[PDB]
Write a protein that binds this ligand. Structure first.
Ligand SMILES: CC(C)[C@]1(CO)CCCN(c2ncnc3[nH]ccc23)C1
Length: 167
């Protein structure tokens, strides 16, 4: 039993809800929140910009130190950093950005990072400003993630479309 509330169950381990991941993180304080990161951990917009703003820029400060030490992430890769006031940990995961021409097959590799964590609150990878089809992102998620994932979908219209078309 965990503290997540109001989700629709898609499968044994995948759940979905119309929610702002920032407000959801602040209420649940999950062990792991997933950020829709880029390789430079520059949290300017989309989910990343929103999560970072909610940390009063502490996420960006921590991220800049991480990059200065380690260099950029790989597309499809991840790193674990602090969750600040939102979660115990933030798993920064880099899905391919279609608007940069990155290979969509890397979306499966991106979701594989979730399997290192028993329970996660997460957005749909490569959705939104990353340019991929969110119905495909949900499908890859379901077919790749085996741990318990709670997907927060900001757009109510998109949320309803994701459910009604799910197989
Ligand atoms: C389609 C999908 C990739 C998105 C909608 O879920 C697109 C728009 C930005 N994304 C967010 N998702 C959940 N919570 C959020 N809070 C602020 C932004 C945000 C991801």
């Amino acid at each position: 039993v965990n503290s997540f509330s109001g989700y629709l169950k898609l499968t044994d381990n995948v759940y979905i809800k119309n929610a702002d991941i920032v407000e959801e993180a602040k209420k649940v304080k999950p062990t792991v929140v997933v950020n829709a990161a880029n390789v430079y951990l520059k949290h300017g917009g989309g989910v990343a910009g929103a999560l970072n703003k909610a940390t009063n820029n502490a996420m960006q400060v921590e991220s800049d130190d991480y990059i200065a030490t380690n260099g950029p992430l790989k597309v499809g890769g991840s790193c674990v950093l602090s969750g600040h006031n939102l979660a115990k940990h933030c798993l920064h995961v880099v899905g391919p950005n279609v608007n940069k021409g990155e290979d969509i097959q890397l979306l499966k590799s991106a979701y594989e990072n979730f399997n290192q964590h028993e329970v996660l609150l997460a957005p749909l990878l490569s959705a939104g400003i990353f340019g991929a089809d969110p119905i495909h992102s949900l499908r890859v998620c379901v077919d790749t993630v085996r741990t318990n994932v709670y997907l927060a979908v900001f757009d109510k219209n998109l949320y309803d479309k994701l459910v009604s078309s799910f197989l």
